[PDB]
Every structure is written in C-alpha cells, then in structure tokens.
Nucleic acid binder design. Structure first.
Ligand SMILES: [Mg+2]
Ligand SMILES: [Mg+2]
Ligand SMILES: [Mg+2]
Ligand SMILES: [Mg+2]
Ligand SMILES: [Mg+2]
Ligand SMILES: [Mg+2]
Lengths: 587, 587, 587
RNA sequence: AAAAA
RNA sequence: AAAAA
RNA sequence: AAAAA
C-alpha cells in the first residue's frame, strides 16, 4: 500500500531495452530517505540518506559523506579474507563514492552545515551489469526523498560507442566492441518547452580495445565524437530524471527546516565593495605579479583598519567578502582583457621539461615538470605472476598494469600525515591509469606485470595529467613498446555576463593549463588525455546551465593543441622504447 | 612473605574436583590491584586493574575499559600472522571482554568518573580448559584488591548438564555429552543466615549435540531445566566469592577516595517532584500516545520556565531530574495498571511479518519485521573449503557456519561511521549464531560452508532475536534442511515496591517484546531463543537481589508462549527447506 | 645552474674508497629544505624538511616527526602484499626513524613549538649497501638547508671492525668478517684549531659471527676496543660534516624567524631561587627519602603561597622553575657528595632476583626483577618453517629469532591504550634482540625458530637491559644451548662545573643502574650488554661537548663490573641449558 | 601520528 | 570519516 | 578505544 514504484525505460534501439525501477516505502523506513533501485529486476541497490539533528556550526564546510557498501552475498560468494568478512572499501567502491559525491555535493544549497550521509548498499548484482551509474541514480533518489534542500534529481547514465551507436547502460559483454565509454551525470533545467538537460559530470575513457577496433574500421574517439556522445546522453538522463521526479512527486517528505550558514552577510560585502571597488580594480591593472600581491596585501590591511570597528568581531566576514570581491574582479578581467592571474595568455602552457633516466637502478624512470608541478614516475616490470589479484563484485579478475599515485605532504610545503592514501589519490591514480591502458602492449607481445608509481614531488594543482605524461615517459624508458604516447592537459573555462556600453550578454573563455588558483575562478574544469589521434581519458565537472556546442568544441580543440605541444616536448626526451634495464626480468 | 593465596575447591561429585587458586603480591605490583588465577595449577591468568589519577568530569558516563590479551605462548605456538605477532583481538577475546564487562560495570557505584581499566592476560592454558569463566573471577579479584568503590566480589562459573548432573567448570572433552551449557555470574547478598547468592548475568546455549543426545534419552533443555540450572550454580558461586573474600580480607589496599559525580542533586529533584508530581501523573492517565508526548513536552517547557532562575545555570540537573521522575511514574504505572508506554498489554508482541525470497540472485534471503524492527538475512552457501580457519587459544579449529551482524547507522536515523563492527555487533552476532548451531544439519548430510549476514535495516532495540528469526527464515529458504526452526524473543521484567492502602510490598511483572525505551524502565532484561521443544540460547542481565523461583518460571513460560506465536507466524512464510537456488553450488 | 653538489670522500685505506654526494636544487623545491644523498652514485635518498606556518603553542613539547619511506621500486620488485602496495612501515623503517630522531631532536633550540617534519624516501638502493647511516646525513642536510634554528650539521657513519681495521660505511659482504659494528653520529665543536667532533649518538652491536671470528684469532669487542672505535669514527664524521657545511654555505635559505616558548621566564626562576635556595638545600641534606619528599612538598606549598599573587596566573612557570631548581641542586649533590636521590652509592645495583620456571606449560620462562623493575620472558620454540619471512629493502630474508617487547600500561600504574606497540617498544625489542644473536646456537646445532616475549610487568625506567637478562634466563631455561649468557646494565653519567674554594672546574661522575628519575639529572645515558668476555650491544645518547678518554673508559669498566655482578646473580638461577619441556617440538 | 586482506 | 591476519 | 601483509 505504501510501496511506490516508478520505472524508466531505456530504449537502446536494436541493442535491447533496459528498465530501471525505483521503489520506496518498504526497506529502511527509519532513515531520512530511502530508495531501492533495480536494474532489469535483478540488480538491486538500497540507498539511505540520513541528516544529523543539529547543525555542527564549528565546521567551515559542508560535511557530506557518501559510502558504498559492496556486500559479497551479491556475487554469490563468501569473502576470501582470513576472517571471511568484507573489510575496507575496495578501489571500485572508492571510485563509486567519488562518482556519487561529485554531482551530489554542489546540489545542496550553499551554507548547509548539518552532516548529511548517503550509504548505497549492493544487495544483488547480475554478473553482466555495472552498478556505479545505477548508484548515482539510487543516491539522487534517496536524497530527493529525504526532504533536504537538494536541488535534484540528478540522473546518471553510461554510454558506449558500439558500431557508431551510442548504447546507454551497456552490459559487460557489450563493452568489448565499444571504442569509447563515458559516464554522464546531469540534471534538467527549464520547464515545459526548454527542458534540456544540463550536464554536471563526465568521466570518460577509451576501452582497452580502441586501437584494434579503430584498425578494424571503427571511428576513433576524437573530440567531435566525444561531443556527439555528450549530446547523445541527454534523452536517457531526461528519462531517469523524469522517473525520479514522478516517484518523489508521489512519496516525498515535506522539506524540513535546515539553517544555512553563509560565509559573509550582505552588509559586510556591500561595504567592502563600496569602499574598495576602485582600489582593487586599479590594483589589478598593473602588469606586475608580485607587486600586485603587495598591493592586495596593502588593501587587506586597509579594509581591516578602516572597517574597525564599525563591524566589530567580524573579521572572518571581512576576509570572506574580500576574497569574493577579488575573485569577481579577476573573473571580469579574464572575461574582458583575456589576461590571467600570472600574465599568461589563454593558450599558454607553462615551462615544460621532460627528462628520462633520472633514478639509478630503476627499471624505468622519468621526471616531468611543468611550471611549479613536478612529477616523478618509476616503472617496475616484474613476473607475470605478480599481477594484482582482485576480489570484489566487479567483473575483472586480475590487474596487470597498476598505477599508484603518491602525494607527499611536502608537495605544497605543508607538514601532515604520511601514510595511507586519501580518496583524492585513488581518484587521481585511477584517472591516470585509465589513460594508458588503451596503448599498453598485449600480454602476448610483452609478458610482464607493469607497475607505475607517480610521486607529486612538487604541486600547484591537478597533478594527474602531469602524472599521465610522466608515466608515458617512464614507460617508454623501461622498454615497454607502447602503441602511441599519451599526453595530458588540465584546462578550465570561465563563463559569465559582461556589459558592453548598453548590452549585457554572456561570454565564455577557455584557459589552457590552469594553476591551482585558477580553479576557484573557473566555472568548469576538465582534463583531457590522449594520443596523437584520439582521446583516451576525459573528466569534467561543471555547474553551468548548459554550454553551447561551439564553446565545447572550441575548448576541446584547444585541449588537443595543448596535448600536441606537450607531445612534441615529450618526443625529444625519448622517441622510442629504450633498452631494458639489465636488472629487469627476461621472459 | 608478601604472596598470599586462597583456593576454592569445586566439588563436581563423581566427575572430578577442580581447584581455582587466587594469588597476589608477586607479579605486577605497580597496578592498583593485581591477581593471578590458576585453574588446576596449569591454567594461569594475570589480571591488573588500574585507575586514573584525576576524574575526567567532561565525560557523561562511567569510563570502564576491559581488555583480554590472548598471548599465544600460552598455546605453545608461534603466531601464524605474516609478522608473527599477536595482532588485534579475536572474536573470543571480545566475547570474554563482554562477559567480564557485563557484571562488572554495574558493580561500581553510581557517579564514578575516573577511568578504570582491567587487562586480563592469558599466560598459560591447558588445551582442555576454558578460561573466560576464569577471567571473570580474575577480574573481580584484581578489582576488589584495587581499593575502588567496587561492591564485589563477583563469582562466575560455567555449568553443563551432563547425564542429569550439573557439572561446574567442565573441560572440553566433557562438554560433548552436555545438552546445555551456561555461564552464571553472581554475588553474595545477605550475611550469616541469609547468604544466598544474587545472580547478575546468565549466558546460556545448547550444545551442538543437543538433538542427538535428547534422541538418546537425555532431558532436553526446557525452561524448567534451565531454572534447575540457575539454582544449581549457586554453591559454586558461593565458593568462589568466599575465596575471593578471604584473599581480599588478607591483602586488600584501603579504599581510596574517589569523587562521585551524580547526574542531579537532591534539591533539584525534590523541587521538580513537588511542583510536577500531579501534573505528570495526570499526564500519564490518558489513553493517547502522541498526545501524552505533547503533554510531556509541555510539562518540560513548564519546568524549564517556572524553575528559572531559582536554579540558574542548572539545566542538565533539571533534565536529569525530569527524566528520573517520568521513569519512576511509568514504572509505578506498569506495576499497578499493567499498561505499558505504548498502550500494549504485557503479553502482546508487536505486528509481525515474515517474508522469504526478498533479494534476487541470493542463495537464500528473508525479511523479518516486528514493530519498528526490520532485519534482512541473506544466506550464502559455498564450498566446504571456505569454512573460516580459526587461529587462537580457543579449542576450535574451523568455523563452518558464520553469522555476521551489521548495524548500519541509519537503523535509528542517525549519521555515523560506517565500517568496522563495534563490540555490540560481535556480541549480537555471537548470540544469534549460538542459537542456530543446535539445529544445523551435519557436515555429512549437507556439505557446505554456510554464511549468514543479518542487516538491521530498521531498529528500535534488541535486534539480535529478530536476527535469529530472520536467520531461520533465510536458512530454510536457501534449502538448508534445519532440524527444527528456531525463534527468538526479547523480554523484560519490572520489579518494585508498591503500597496498597496500608501495606508496602514488592511486586513483579513481565513485559513481552520490550521496545528500546522499555529497557530503561526494567529491572531485568533477558532474551530467549529456541525451537518448539527446548531453549537453544538464553541471556540475562539483572541487578535485583534475587528473583523467586515462581517469578522466573512465569517469565520463562511467557517467553515460550511468545516464541510459539512467532514460530506460527514464521511457519506461514516457509514451511520446509525450499529448492536450492540455481546459482548455489552442488556437492 | 641552481643545482649544487658537494662530495665527501670516505677513505677506508685498502678496503676501498666511498663517496657520499649531497645535491640540492632540483627535486622537491616546495619543501622548506630538500637534499638528495647518493652513496657511490647508485644509492639515492631524498630528504625533505617542512615546518608549519603557525606555532602550535597548546603543545607542551617540541613536535618533530621523522618518517622514512621505503619505496619498493628501489629494490626492483613489486610489493608482495595482497594490494601490491607498500603499506605500513616495516621494523627497519622504524629503527631508522629512531636513528634519525635521536641526534636530530636535541639539535633544535629549546622552546621551538612549530611542527617540523622530515621525510626520507629511498629512491634507489644497491643490494650491497645499507642506507640508515646515509639517512642520518640526508636528514641533517635537508634540515640544515631549511633555515630552521638547527645547530647542525649532524654527520653519521657506520664503522665495522674487520681484521683490526675500522672500516667506515662497509658493505654487506664486508660485514661478515667484522666482529663489531657501530653507528656513530656526532657534530663538530670548536673552529679552526680545536675542531674535534663531539659524538652525540652511538648504536653498536657485535655481529652474529663474533664468537667464531674471535676463536679464529680476532680481537673480541671488549670495552677498550669499543673506545678505539669511538675514537676511530671521528675523521669520517669530520668529512661528512665538512661536506654538508660546504653545500649549506652555498645554497642555504636565510634563517626564518621562529618564536621560542620557554617553560619559564627569568624573573620567576630568579625569584624562586632567591627565596628557596637555602630551604631546598637544607631539604636535601637529610638522610631520609620519604621525609625529603614531604619536605619538598612543603616547600612546593610554600612557593605557591608566598609567590601569590606577585606573579598571578603564572602557576606553570612556578612549577617549571621549582623543578629546574631541584634538578640543579640534586645535580650539584651528586657531583659533590656522590649521593644519589635514593641514598644509593654510585656503584650500587638495586636488589636483584632471577627466577626460572615461572609460567607453567611454557617452553621456557623466567622472571627477572631489579628494584621496581620486573620483567617476564617467555621463550617459545617451534618448527623451523615458522621463522618470520621478511619482505623489505633490507638485505635479510628470514628472521629465525624474534624478540617481541610488550610494555603494558599498568607497568607504571597508569591506564591507557592496550594494543599496537609504539616506536619505543620496537626500539627496545630491537636493542634487546641484537644483544642475544651473537650467542645463539647455529641453525644446524639447534634447528628451531625461537621466539621471545618480554613483558614489562613492573617498570621504573630503561627496561630493555632487564629484558636482555630475562631473555638469557628464559632461553637457558627452554633448553637452548647458548654459547655464553648475556647480561645487561643501564648506566648514566652526570657532568658539570663545581667550584672548590677558589677554583671552578668541570668534574664527571658515573651512576650505575640509574632509575627513571636519575635520567633527567644525567648528562649522558648509555646501556651496555654483554657476556663475560665482550660487549654484544651498546647504546649511548649524549649532548656534552666531548668526554675525555679516561672518563669514558672508567664508565665502561664500571658497566662491566655491574654486568659481572648481574651475571653472578643470574648464574645461581640456572647454570646450564635445562631439559626441553615435554610440550616442545623435537627435531 | 610524533617525543618520554 | 568526509572536502581542499 | 571503551558504554548504549
Ligand atoms: Mg581542475
Ligand atoms: Mg575535474
Ligand atoms: Mg534487553
Ligand atoms: Mg541481555
Ligand atoms: Mg637511560
Ligand atoms: Mg639510551
């Protein structure tokens, strides 16, 4: 009676027809919201969102926590541990936690301080399905039901390019003819007539068989093909969002009253603006970097002195308002004068250097530095029996090529805990590993168990693409006969309204090779890695209400040009797979 | 010279004669108290109790911590880990920590805030003895010596029903003819002539051979037999308590001065009583649940307003006194009008529903919900080589049937840490696992390695018995040919003085299927699980100075009636072991 | 261009010639200081020191943290874990962290509160070199560069006694003819003409082949030989310190401004001195221990009352000044009247008792107590297949004899966390294990995998030498045919200026078997363990600017006399290897 | 970490 | 721990 | 660390 259902019928043409079914009202009725998601009546996940009672205001950020529980009775097996129990999250559970957390975290209003928490449990899994793109839907549903200030729903799909057809939610036996495979997550903006979706997250990779299939006669995953993919995942996200909205229009709890804690009030920001606008503006027109820093520090002292004490005991509000003001002014500058915070041009990569044979007695090694970023990659071939043995719900058994990404605390100069990797390091390692598997040689043409270790010896921001380039260098050095070198580049996009003399219109600009500071002044950040001919990895997080096709194509072609320059810089360090190190094993 | 001994001679008639020897003054003379306990001059434990110097008042509870250290040189073996060192506590060490903590925690006075800590180390273990029932004695002794406000000593024994004889402290080769096996822990009340013991803890289970032995001609462990057992463990607890008291009358340190921190003073409680007694009393006479909640909230606002500020800055005392007052009034109501906090009768179980075949692609599964409680059990048969390999001091080698109990944070609606299980979850898993081993089929009639996973999807209190019922359902579903289904029920008992017109006498009442709130209004809480014919598991924690035999027999027969109703509700979901799932292995 | 080098040429005569090369300016340019250290162009470590921005004043101690990262690509191998990743630090990484932390921690000025941190990463390792004595140099260099208040540099070397020649930085194939092997770390004091080094740390052990080699005709590592070793490691420390100083005179960052937080100001200490000097002095002349404690407590009450409130809200300064005053007066007493804090003489060991056959059903066991210290050792022979399998950069494969050292919290009477061992326990276990390997029987004459467990049942200070004696007792008891028993003793040395009637001269005194309190009144603390004929382990931490050869020889001969008395006390408990326990395995 | 498966 | 054984 | 390777 109190169990409500709603289905979304995914229509893949002649490749089949799937049905994702959302059900609520039966299981876990104590959480703030709960929802069970079935994929083809056989895959079954349970998501349950709970919010804390009191807002922990001592925090300075929104404390959302996603957990994915891979129960092993889903696979019909007993865990293989010594204690026959499911222990700590595997790598796939962490990657799915990140997939869920990325489009869900910016969906909550700005200033929420309660401790929201989502826990997606895999209760059944058909051995031919993937569940992460279903975990996104289950989490969005169970958060939409909870009555939180969650501007959803958030529909997520996975599309694969099989024989020129973009198949949505493909099985595992179908992901062996696909050249490209991407997870797209978005939401619907506009009602009735302008209901187009607004993609928020893209995580794309070229399958391990892209080279053989493209040699067979397929179409390689270039940038135009990736744009066709981004435009061919919209109907499915529309279907999923419509189904979630039907269910939550049946059985949603009325919106609770959660207090929001803004960083600064309106009065303080208006005051800082009115009394420092022209000062900060003329502080930005000067062609000097460090001098501009000194002038900004002086303006900081000035706002601290002249606003004391008309606003007594409100120093954090002053600082937050000043940071918002300088961010707005730098954004307007980047939009109008095309000049970035370090005098660089929009299409200028920092100073590149690639060196091979850095570490002695290593099988292969290389040091790739770009600007302040400096990565060291060390490839360690070994016996094929050393391939990592995977034990999880996922379809794969062994991992021949392992990419491990270390981010020591002194990369930025800050002390901290050295030890176990965080979730960021797992995400960066996975992103930089899925960018090299398309070009690795076969297990018959090169029978070893490669293992890559990338060290962020110096960091300014977004070191995963630098790690892709350093991994290509180290892998060519160790003697591994890659099919083609894979470069990488991490760009951003700033979009906003500007007023010419009497017109107020939106304009966009792309920034090549952004720093860590240019990530807070950007409205989209995306990382493209690929060879000379096709993209092997792509990742994109945005919050804009839709990007025109021309702007996306332009930014992606700019990314290709950056990749080609980086590739011509890398091809001077090492052109071909060098000789095996005398310490390397021989098979 | 300063080494004092005292022996307790356990006289098991014709089954032997044991001697537990307590020794102090030689080892670990830096702790607040220390004592070595020998069982038959060969089993040797060392317990050492230490108290912190300053009372950590910021805590809101008594911070006692028990640890049991299973040193492996006791078993004559080197640890088998990769690092050849004893790592984290096994399951048996955790269960023994709980066995010690359960009768020891209520023995300290109310309001102690120092950080007491007990650490029992197993220094030698004969391979034919059990040491947990000896760990209780060692811990009680070493805490009685420390000069703490510890109202001991606490004597603990293990009795087994072998051929109609209740044998105390039986070996492992003797626990194979026993039908029932129970650990009893109690203390002596009354001096000289009325020195009868007052049992505080019972943890009982029917041995894995109960069905075969009862078929042979034994007497099945019914409720009258369990009462005979509770009355046949009194002389041994008397002996152990007398020995500990001899030793601590020889070599105990004078009682130190430890401050106590009451939750509320006498003045505040007297004031709240005098000014809210009749209001809260008439607030309880109304037949409405939610309306009564609103009236109690109104009385809370009233006590907060009219007592402000005659007691300024004393809000916690107000709240604690109000909670004590409402608890006392609800207790008097339950004693007089037989009506509980939710209008239920004393012999009324909540609304039951049992469903099988819930999860798809699972070997067996079932969902059992009772009231707000809702448990999901998933049975996963596999190959016999997957039985858990145990490596510890304990006598068992492998664990064929594994019960794992998960309590997610959203069971109550609260966010929290998802991950490793606490000690409560280990205790509940063990209690619900020892309730099903008496009825599991042999390793020859059903050659698999069963594994059960019980999920507390919805929780109000005491979900372990619900997990026993859900495990019976899931196990019958997966095709496992049980010998008889095993139900469970978690009851309580409220006992107190009441005054009829001119007489003040003690009366008792039993409450069937208590909630989580009816656990703070009860003077005993006990859980009984069993088949149609005999109890397979029992657990009981009390603080009363002895219960008449009639009251205990009545409460236990009431528990049997609850079990029979639950069993007739479960027999409609699934009557017989269903067909094996096509995914299950075939041997 | 910005990459600076400096080499130190170690000249081992006819045994070879090594070259340690320090390089800076290329890798990890974001840390406060960074330096790469090469040993023979093939071993390569990277050290990077970072300091926090703000001084965490809430701490009560200097928060330095050293980490050693053993990257496995150094050894050309993939890690062997299930997850094929380097997990938690091995034992060798912890011992190297301690080797670095011991001479580095007292090098920083007194009162630093920022959170310094050193992280030494092993990027390449020739399989014939050791890297810990190189890690000390890399850490001292990268800390000298950081611009901290670090009074370095600190040069560390390893010398081995091969055929009467003290070889510096010997390989692994050369450490098989050495009888003694010691790590020496020191710094240079005096400039120009009196530039002699001032050793700060010594960690010495006799190689596993000392007995066979001494039988061959070598010179056993007596105390005079160890003194010759301490005098033969000075030129190499001079070379290393000169090289580090050349580099840091090329490319060091100017000293930053770090605030220091003294424990007490000058005014408070001067006041407490002026108003309590004679009171505390006459409080020390009395021959009563406990009475002196009462008088000191009375003087504490007096300084708290009469200095209140001329210094209001300054209680911690009062306490720190009082502790400094009493420490100074006890030091002057020990220097002048030769009387220690407990009336003992300078050459008096506490009351010794050694007992064997303590624990029943153990392969071997013994209890050795000295004063308040009381250690229990339990030897557990087993099958040779149980030897610990090591997987790390280090040269060793298996560990036949394992010494595990447990320090329970109740050793001092304080509650705490029972569980994983700290770094102190690893250091003490290693120190007490390297003291028994010289005398263990071969793998052919006694084919078992011994394992020792030492329990600090009672502790006053420095229980590692007591654990060496208890391990000798337990090992003789279990039937292991040692080549000679190994005793141990932990002495200290107090050195200071004293003024006779008109002369102010430095005098030294040695204290045999110091307590835990006599460690804060001592200017050096060293532990010597050995057999009747030679030292098998030695450890020494000092801060003095050089000790005359006569004083060191005297203190070491005093240590030998203490060892001989302890050995004659141990030889009465058990003279010869007893019979194997009937539970022990037979090979 | 962290110093005593 | 969740964001940067 | 625990109590609920
Ligand atoms: Mg970015
Ligand atoms: Mg991104
Ligand atoms: Mg209960
Ligand atoms: Mg109970
Ligand atoms: Mg010492
Ligand atoms: Mg020392």
């Amino acid at each position: 009676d109190g169990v409500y259902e709603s289905t979304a019928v995914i229509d893949n043409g002649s490749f089949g027809t799937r049905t994702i079914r959302f059900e609520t009202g039966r299981l876990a009725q104590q959480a703030a919201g709960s929802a069970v998601a079935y994929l083809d009546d056989e895959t079954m996940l349970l998501s349950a969102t709970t919010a804390s009672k009191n807002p922990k205001d001592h925090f300075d950020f929104f404390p959302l926590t996603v957990d994915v529980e891979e129960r092993m009775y889903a696979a019909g097996r007993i865990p293989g541990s010594f204690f026959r129990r499911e222990g700590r999250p595997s790598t796939d559970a962490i990657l799915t936690c990140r997939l869920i957390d990325r489009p869900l975290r910016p969906s909550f209003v700005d200033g929420l301080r309660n401790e929201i928490q989502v826990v997606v449990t895999v209760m059944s899994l058909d051995p031919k399905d993937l569940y992460d793109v279903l975990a996104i839907n289950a989490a969005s549903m169970s958060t939409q039901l909870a009555g939180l200030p969650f501007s959803g729903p958030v529909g997520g799909a996975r599309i694969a390019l099989i024989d020129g057809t973009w198949v949505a939610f493909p099985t595992v036996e179908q992901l062996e003819r696909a050249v490209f495979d991407m997870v797209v997550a978005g939401r619907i903006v506009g009602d009735g007539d302008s209901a187009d979706v607004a993609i928020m997250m893209v995580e794309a990779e070229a399958t391990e068989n892209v080279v053989e299939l493209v040699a067979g006669g397929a179409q390689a995953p270039t940038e135009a093909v990736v744009a066709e993919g981004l435009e061919a995942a919209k109907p499915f996200i529309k279907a999923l969002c419509a189904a979630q909205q039907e269910l939550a229009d049946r059985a949603a709890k009325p919106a609770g009253e959660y207090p929001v804690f803004p960083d600064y009030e309106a009065d303080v920001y208006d005051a800082v603006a009115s009394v420092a606008t022209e000062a900060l503006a003329e502080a930005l027109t000067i062609a000097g970097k460090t001098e501009r820093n000194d002038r900004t520090d002086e303006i900081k002292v000035e706002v601290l002195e002249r606003l004391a004490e008309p606003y007594a005991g409100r120093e954090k509000e002053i600082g937050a308002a000043f940071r918002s003001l300088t961010k707005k002014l730098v954004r307007q500058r980047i939009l109008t004068d095309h000049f970035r915070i370090d005098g660089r041009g929009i299409t200028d990569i920092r100073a590149l250097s690639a060196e091979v044979a850095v570490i002695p007695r290593a099988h292969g090694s290389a040091l790739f530095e770009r600007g302040e970023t400096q990565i060291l990659g060390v490839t360690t071939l070994d016996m094929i029996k050393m391939a990592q043995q995977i034990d999880s719900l996922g379809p794969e058994n062994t991992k021949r090529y392992m990419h491990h990404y270390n981010f020591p605390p002194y990369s930025t100069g800050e002390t901290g805990r050295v030890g176990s990797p965080k979730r960021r390091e797992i995400g960066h390692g996975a992103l930089a590993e899925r960018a090299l598997v398309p070009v690795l040689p076969s297990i018959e043409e090169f029978p070893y168990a490669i293992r890559q270790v990338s060290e962020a010896l110096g960091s300014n921001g977004s070191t995963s693409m630098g790690s892709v380039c350093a991994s290509t260098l180290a892998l060519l050095n160790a003697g591994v006969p890659l099919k083609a070198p894979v470069a990488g580049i991490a760009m951003g996009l700033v979009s906003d309204d500007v007023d010419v003399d009497g017109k107020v219109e939106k304009r966009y600009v792309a920034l090549t090779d952004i720093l860590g500071a240019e990530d807070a002044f950007g409205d989209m950040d995306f990382k493209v890695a690929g060879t000379k001919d096709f993209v092997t990895a792509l990742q994109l997080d945005t919050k804009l209400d839709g990007i025109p096709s021309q702007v996306l194509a332009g930014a992606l072609s700019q990314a290709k040009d950056a990749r080609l320059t980086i590739l011509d810089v890398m091809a001077e360090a090492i052109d071909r797979p060098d000789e095996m190190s005398p310490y390397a094993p021989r098979i």
